[PDB]
Amino acid sequence: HMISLIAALAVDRVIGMENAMPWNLPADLAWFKRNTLNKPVIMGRHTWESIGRPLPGRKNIILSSQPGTDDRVTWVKSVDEAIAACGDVPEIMVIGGGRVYEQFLPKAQKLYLTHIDAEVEGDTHFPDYEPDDWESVFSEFHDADAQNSHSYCFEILERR
Ligand SMILES: NC(=O)c1ccc[n+]([C@@H]2O[C@H](COP(=O)([O-])OP(=O)(O)OC[C@H]3O[C@@H](n4cnc5c(N)ncnc54)[C@H](OP(=O)(O)O)[C@@H]3O)[C@@H](O)[C@H]2O)c1
Numbered sequence: 132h133m134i135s136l137i138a139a140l141a142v143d144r145v146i147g148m149e150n151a152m153p154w155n156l157p158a159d160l161a162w163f164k165r166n167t168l169n170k171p172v173i174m175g176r177h178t179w180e181s182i183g184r185p186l187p188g189r190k191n192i193i194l195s196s197q198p199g200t201d202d203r204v205t206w207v208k209s210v211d212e213a214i215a216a217c218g219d220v221p222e223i224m225v226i227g228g229g230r231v232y233e234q235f236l237p238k239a240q241k242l243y244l245t246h247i248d249a250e251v252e253g254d255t256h257f258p259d260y261e262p263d264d265w266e267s268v269f270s271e272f273h274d275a276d277a278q279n280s281h282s283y284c285f286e287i288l289e290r291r
Pocket residue numbers: 137138139140145146147148149150151152174175176177178179181194195196197207208209210226227228229230231232234255
Protein backbone atom coordinates (compact mmCIF):
# COMPACT_ATOMS: atom_id res chain seq x y z
CA HIS A 132 0.00 0.00 0.00
CA MET A 133 0.95 3.67 0.42
CA ILE A 134 0.84 6.43 3.05
CA SER A 135 0.21 10.01 1.87
CA LEU A 136 0.09 13.28 3.79
CA ILE A 137 -2.30 16.06 2.81
CA ALA A 138 -1.97 19.56 4.25
CA ALA A 139 -2.50 23.24 3.46
CA LEU A 140 0.42 25.50 4.41
CA ALA A 141 0.55 29.26 4.66
CA VAL A 142 3.82 31.23 4.76
CA ASP A 143 6.56 29.63 6.90
CA ARG A 144 4.67 26.27 6.78
CA VAL A 145 2.03 27.54 9.23
CA ILE A 146 -0.94 25.16 9.39
CA GLY A 147 -2.81 26.19 12.54
CA MET A 148 -3.49 28.76 15.24
CA GLU A 149 -5.24 28.11 18.57
CA ASN A 150 -6.49 24.78 17.18
CA ALA A 151 -8.17 26.47 14.21
CA MET A 152 -7.38 27.05 10.54
CA PRO A 153 -6.20 30.66 10.10
CA TRP A 154 -7.73 31.16 6.64
CA ASN A 155 -10.86 30.51 4.59
CA LEU A 156 -10.20 28.87 1.19
CA PRO A 157 -13.17 26.85 -0.09
CA ALA A 158 -11.36 25.76 -3.28
CA ASP A 159 -8.71 24.11 -1.11
CA LEU A 160 -11.24 22.42 1.17
CA ALA A 161 -12.79 21.10 -2.06
CA TRP A 162 -9.41 19.75 -3.15
CA PHE A 163 -9.06 18.13 0.29
CA LYS A 164 -12.42 16.39 -0.07
CA ARG A 165 -11.67 15.21 -3.61
CA ASN A 166 -8.35 13.67 -2.54
CA THR A 167 -9.57 12.01 0.68
CA LEU A 168 -13.09 10.81 -0.18
CA ASN A 169 -13.50 7.03 0.08
CA LYS A 170 -10.10 6.64 1.76
CA PRO A 171 -9.18 6.17 5.41
CA VAL A 172 -8.01 9.39 7.08
CA ILE A 173 -5.67 9.39 10.10
CA MET A 174 -5.66 12.43 12.37
CA GLY A 175 -4.50 13.46 15.81
CA ARG A 176 -6.95 14.21 18.61
CA HIS A 177 -6.48 18.00 18.34
CA THR A 178 -7.36 17.93 14.66
CA TRP A 179 -10.38 15.73 15.42
CA GLU A 180 -11.54 18.46 17.81
CA SER A 181 -10.82 21.22 15.27
CA ILE A 182 -12.88 19.50 12.54
CA GLY A 183 -15.65 18.84 15.07
CA ARG A 184 -17.43 15.85 13.49
CA PRO A 185 -16.67 12.74 11.40
CA LEU A 186 -15.70 13.43 7.82
CA PRO A 187 -18.42 11.68 5.77
CA GLY A 188 -17.49 9.02 3.24
CA ARG A 189 -14.14 8.33 4.93
CA LYS A 190 -12.99 5.96 7.65
CA ASN A 191 -11.96 8.39 10.42
CA ILE A 192 -9.05 7.12 12.56
CA ILE A 193 -8.08 9.23 15.61
CA LEU A 194 -4.78 8.92 17.43
CA SER A 195 -4.96 9.50 21.17
CA SER A 196 -3.12 8.06 24.15
CA GLN A 197 -6.47 8.22 26.02
CA PRO A 198 -9.72 6.23 25.65
CA GLY A 199 -12.02 7.18 22.81
CA THR A 200 -14.98 9.51 23.41
CA ASP A 201 -17.05 8.93 20.24
CA ASP A 202 -18.01 5.62 18.63
CA ARG A 203 -18.65 7.21 15.23
CA VAL A 204 -14.88 7.04 14.61
CA THR A 205 -12.01 4.63 15.28
CA TRP A 206 -9.61 5.39 18.14
CA VAL A 207 -6.05 4.02 18.14
CA LYS A 208 -3.14 4.47 20.55
CA SER A 209 -0.08 4.33 18.25
CA VAL A 210 1.08 4.98 14.69
CA ASP A 211 1.33 1.26 13.87
CA GLU A 212 -2.20 0.65 15.18
CA ALA A 213 -3.55 3.58 13.15
CA ILE A 214 -2.05 2.11 9.98
CA ALA A 215 -3.42 -1.35 10.83
CA ALA A 216 -6.90 0.04 11.48
CA CYS A 217 -6.94 1.36 7.90
CA GLY A 218 -7.26 -2.17 6.52
CA ASP A 219 -6.00 -3.21 3.09
CA VAL A 220 -6.50 -0.05 1.04
CA PRO A 221 -4.48 1.47 -1.81
CA GLU A 222 -3.85 4.78 -0.09
CA ILE A 223 -3.92 5.97 3.50
CA MET A 224 -4.43 9.73 3.91
CA VAL A 225 -2.81 11.37 6.93
CA ILE A 226 -4.55 14.67 7.59
CA GLY A 227 -2.53 16.13 10.50
CA GLY A 228 -1.96 17.97 12.55
CA GLY A 229 1.61 19.00 13.28
CA ARG A 230 2.53 16.21 15.71
CA VAL A 231 0.94 13.53 13.53
CA TYR A 232 2.45 14.83 10.28
CA GLU A 233 5.87 14.67 11.91
CA GLN A 234 5.42 10.98 12.78
CA PHE A 235 4.08 9.90 9.37
CA LEU A 236 6.33 11.96 7.07
CA PRO A 237 9.18 9.37 7.20
CA LYS A 238 6.63 6.70 6.22
CA ALA A 239 4.96 8.66 3.40
CA GLN A 240 5.43 8.14 -0.30
CA LYS A 241 3.34 11.10 -1.42
CA LEU A 242 2.55 14.63 -0.20
CA TYR A 243 -0.50 16.62 -1.27
CA LEU A 244 0.43 20.20 -0.37
CA THR A 245 -1.47 23.40 -0.92
CA HIS A 246 0.75 26.47 -0.65
CA ILE A 247 -1.36 29.46 0.43
CA ASP A 248 -0.06 32.99 -0.22
CA ALA A 249 -1.12 34.17 3.24
CA GLU A 250 0.76 35.56 6.24
CA VAL A 251 -0.76 34.27 9.46
CA GLU A 252 0.36 33.90 13.05
CA GLY A 253 0.53 30.20 13.83
CA ASP A 254 1.44 27.86 16.65
CA THR A 255 1.49 24.72 14.47
CA HIS A 256 3.67 23.99 11.44
CA PHE A 257 4.02 21.37 8.77
CA PRO A 258 7.23 19.38 9.33
CA ASP A 259 10.44 20.64 7.73
CA TYR A 260 10.94 18.08 4.98
CA GLU A 261 14.13 17.62 2.96
CA PRO A 262 13.42 18.92 -0.58
CA ASP A 263 16.00 16.59 -2.17
CA ASP A 264 13.83 13.63 -1.13
CA TRP A 265 10.79 14.72 -3.15
CA GLU A 266 9.85 15.12 -6.82
CA SER A 267 7.05 17.45 -7.87
CA VAL A 268 4.66 15.53 -10.14
CA PHE A 269 1.77 18.04 -10.24
CA SER A 270 1.51 21.78 -9.74
CA GLU A 271 -1.48 24.06 -10.31
CA PHE A 272 -1.52 27.75 -9.36
CA HIS A 273 -4.71 29.74 -8.80
CA ASP A 274 -5.17 33.47 -8.30
CA ALA A 275 -7.46 34.80 -5.60
CA ASP A 276 -11.10 35.35 -6.58
CA ALA A 277 -14.51 36.26 -5.13
CA GLN A 278 -14.69 32.97 -3.17
CA ASN A 279 -10.97 32.52 -2.26
CA SER A 280 -9.27 35.49 -0.64
CA HIS A 281 -5.69 34.27 -1.27
CA SER A 282 -3.82 32.83 -4.20
CA TYR A 283 -2.80 29.22 -3.67
CA CYS A 284 -0.95 26.45 -5.47
CA PHE A 285 -1.88 22.75 -5.42
CA GLU A 286 1.16 20.47 -5.46
CA ILE A 287 1.68 16.72 -5.32
CA LEU A 288 5.14 15.43 -4.39
CA GLU A 289 6.30 11.82 -4.72
CA ARG A 290 9.22 10.49 -2.69
CA ARG A 291 12.27 9.99 -4.91
N1 LIG B 1 -3.72 23.29 7.51
C1 LIG B 1 -3.72 21.91 7.60
O1 LIG B 1 -3.45 21.25 6.60
C2 LIG B 1 -3.99 21.29 8.89
C3 LIG B 1 -4.16 19.82 8.98
C4 LIG B 1 -4.54 19.36 10.32
C5 LIG B 1 -4.60 20.20 11.36
N2 LIG B 1 -4.29 21.56 11.23
C6 LIG B 1 -4.14 22.38 12.46
O2 LIG B 1 -3.20 21.70 13.26
C7 LIG B 1 -3.46 22.02 14.64
C8 LIG B 1 -3.41 20.75 15.52
O3 LIG B 1 -2.22 20.11 15.22
P1 LIG B 1 -1.46 19.53 16.67
O4 LIG B 1 -0.07 19.26 16.25
O5 LIG B 1 -1.71 20.63 17.67
O6 LIG B 1 -2.22 18.23 17.26
P2 LIG B 1 -2.55 16.86 16.35
O7 LIG B 1 -1.29 16.35 15.77
O8 LIG B 1 -3.78 17.09 15.51
O9 LIG B 1 -3.07 15.87 17.56
C9 LIG B 1 -2.06 15.74 18.53
C10 LIG B 1 -2.65 14.69 19.53
O10 LIG B 1 -2.87 13.45 18.84
C11 LIG B 1 -2.54 12.40 19.72
N3 LIG B 1 -1.38 11.69 19.19
C12 LIG B 1 -0.45 12.09 18.22
N4 LIG B 1 0.47 11.15 17.96
C13 LIG B 1 0.11 10.08 18.80
C14 LIG B 1 0.68 8.81 19.03
N5 LIG B 1 1.79 8.38 18.35
N6 LIG B 1 0.12 7.94 19.93
C15 LIG B 1 -0.99 8.41 20.58
N7 LIG B 1 -1.64 9.57 20.48
C16 LIG B 1 -1.04 10.41 19.57
C17 LIG B 1 -2.34 13.03 21.14
O11 LIG B 1 -3.57 13.09 21.65
P3 LIG B 1 -3.69 12.78 23.43
O12 LIG B 1 -3.18 14.11 23.89
O13 LIG B 1 -5.17 12.55 23.52
O14 LIG B 1 -2.78 11.57 23.65
C18 LIG B 1 -1.75 14.40 20.74
O15 LIG B 1 -2.04 15.31 21.75
C19 LIG B 1 -4.84 22.73 14.69
O16 LIG B 1 -4.56 24.11 14.71
C20 LIG B 1 -5.44 22.39 13.33
O17 LIG B 1 -6.28 23.43 12.88
C21 LIG B 1 -4.07 22.11 9.98
